[PDB]
Design a protein around this ligand. Structure first.
Ligand SMILES: COC(=O)CNC(=O)c1cc(C)on1
Lengths: 412, 412
């Protein structure tokens, strides 16, 4: 019968810091991680900024010999996973290694690696493709390389549900532990899609903010002047642990994961329905999964991408689900500061939702200067709001109409 | 407790045919689907052959205009899925659409699309990249497009576990139903990695057979002259259904899915351990999951990729799990005929395992002319072997040492 699941470790690379505490300090101070991109020439692109990871040192984590074989999204995933395991205090042994697995996902995976090997193939021929091209680029290799380096013999897999990946990875990892398939899971996601194909591809769809002259003001969820999402890089990992297993080893418990929802919009390949019908179905699934009254929800870490249709759909979903309580809860988009980490968005936002519970503070939605028509909830505009938070919800919505919701609450 | 899960519809594209019955007919006749790859200049490549899907008509499923938006791997996944749903006779309604989900995966995803768009990008800059590049290339769009087309509002996700994708997709979809998160799932995988990038990538790792003179003899699992795997394209989909839901509407039930195991080798990025310790833990996990004794297994559809170390690891794992019964069961690699469909391998091989149960025949391992040292099991060399099969295993062992096993049983 269904076991309880708690968070005992977290790890992060974001546009705001090389770990969780540095990233969280940025979140609470309303600081932007968005800047003109330096690692390539974007003069021919309509968008030339994003959330880069600044000063990442892979030799904190991996031999330069192993790192050279791996796409940045895999390096980023391994870094956040290592931080999370270290933070958990968990010791891997012959007695428990079969009961510890990993589910680290990505939306796009090794697009930089694939681009560069495509350049080699076309200009110089197949004999110049890296021998490490496949294992260094495919999405399951965060799970793979993490299991090899730590000796994790539990369930080993990877989700790819575009901008929902991080949320789905965490939720399904919790189900693994809930149903007895594992006692410990490392789950989250990683993304580094800032290459010609990434910025060019989202650019071709006209999905990106083109605010090149004021990059820090680009991501403005629910603001009347929003013009698309900001593309950002990084990783979130959490150590999920069966409750009694955590208690037995004296673990520090950040929070309990009580609810997970999924739903499909079945509406459009890329556009959310205007009324947030799918987001609403997903949140209700997650709240029934948690055995909660919707009035218990204090804080929502919104998907809040800063797209016209996305932001309004979320307001409509929240008002539909929560009715009058919609005006009492606090809802914010940390994407206002981090931009959109795509497959990693749900992973870092789950960590922010947990730290919201730890510190009893709603992160701000920065740049919310002129809330749009009907965006009249507490969106924690401009500045972090200390407040009572017992239950925190983290939402993600992606291409293919894929929805995920995680429900966390304080553990005593 | 846990609900029972049955297979009520199947769909496939393979190197042997454009549906299940034509593919199965080739399997039972020992036909090869391997041939030199056409409409592609492979002169500079060390491998020039593979399993292509021959005569595929996407307009049987989609308008030309919607097809143009989607990578071949998504077209193939949609074709198998549409087939499987049609085969099931399921009627989607407002009363059940929230209870019907999708988990169709891919190991490598949109290589062909990435290749064609790199060309535009490098030659003409980012403004020639297709607007549909991202939604048309990401692995979750088979699940996405299927859900939108059929109005499926159930769990919507996609796995990517390299060569284990199809096995994990089906297993985790079976869990969704067993644990009451859905009544129906469409699950499996699809792959189209015969671009330069796939043939070049695996080729740079020296993972592929280079037997260009005799492509039909290249895939020779457990034969002493094997020189690596053969790259193949296609898709498999199964309609998974709760037993009582299937019975109530009078569905034709092919077989029951009684077991699913997962494990990680935690050994090497690309190679299995010599003794197949990981594959052994995974098969034991699947049999424990099914409540079955190893002696009850009659038929194993091996991973059997025709790599030196992969094939010998699976023999060691089968002898270790089954001891004095390892010689009584039959184990074959249909990859002798189909080649290795990577993320689709587990989906098409689960269908072959279900059809082994329906028709009471073990498919052959063709090309097994000279079994290698220790390869002394009943590997169904050369020709199909009619026999009693109450219980069939399907194994997948992928990059990152990720393992999956499905256990199917006759239903009456
Ligand atoms: C149309 O009104 C709503 O959707 C809000 N009503 C709920 O049913 C709801 C369900 C759960 C769980 O939390 N809120």
């Amino acid at each position: 019968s269904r076991r309880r699941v708690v968070i005992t470790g977290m790890g992060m690379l974001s546009p705001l810091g090389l770990d969780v505490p540095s990233s969280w300090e940025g979140i609470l101070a309303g600081r932007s991680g968005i800047a003109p991109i330096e690692h390539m020439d974007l003069s021919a692109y309509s968008t030339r900024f994003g959330g880069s990871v600044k000063g990442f040192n892979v030799e904190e984590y991996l031999s330069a010999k192993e790192a050279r074989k791996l796409d940045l999204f895999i390096q980023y995933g391994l870094a956040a996973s290592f931080q999370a395991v270290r933070d958990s205090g968990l010791e891997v042994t012959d007695a428990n290694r079969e009961r510890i697995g990993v589910s680290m996902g990505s939306g796009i995976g090794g697009l930089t690696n694939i681009e560069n090997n495509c350049r080699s193939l076309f200009e110089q021929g197949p004999r110049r493709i890296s021998p490490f091209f496949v294992p260094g680029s495919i999405i399951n290799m965060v799970s793979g390389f993490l299991s090899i380096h730590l000796g994790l013999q539990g369930p080993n897999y990877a989700l790819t549900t575009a901008q929902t990946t991080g949320t789905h990875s965490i939720g399904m990892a919790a189900r693994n532990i809930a149903y007895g398939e594992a006692d410990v899971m490392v789950a989250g996601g990683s993304e580094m899609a800032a290459c010609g194909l990434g910025l060019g591809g989202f650019g071709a769809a006209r999905a990106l903010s083109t605010r090149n002259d004021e990059p820090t003001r680009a991501s403005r969820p629910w603001d009347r002047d929003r013009d698309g999402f900001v593309l950002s890089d990084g990783s979130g990992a959490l150590v999920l642990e069966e409750l009694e297993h955590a208690r037995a080893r004296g673990a520090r418990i950040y929070a309990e994961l009580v609810g997970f929802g999924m739903s499909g919009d079945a509406f459009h390949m890329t556009a959310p329905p205007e009324d947030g019908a799918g987001a609403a179905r997903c949140m209700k699934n997650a709240l029934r999964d948690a055995g909660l009254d919707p009035r218990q929800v204090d804080y929502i870490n919104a998907h809040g991408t800063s797209t016209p249709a996305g932001d309004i759909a979320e307001i409509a979903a929240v008002k539909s689900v929560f009715g009058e309580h919609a005006h009492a809860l606090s809802m914010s988009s940390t994407k206002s500061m981090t931009g959109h980490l795509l497959g990693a968005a749900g992973a870092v936002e789950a960590i922010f939702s947990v730290l919201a519970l730890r510190d009893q503070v709603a992160p701000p939605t920065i740049n919310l200067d002129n809330p749009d028509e009907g965006c009249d909830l507490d969106l924690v505009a401009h500045e972090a709001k200390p407040r009572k938070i017992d239950v925190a919800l983290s939402n993600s919505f992606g291409f293919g109409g894929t929805n995920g919701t995680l429900v966390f609450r304080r553990f005593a």
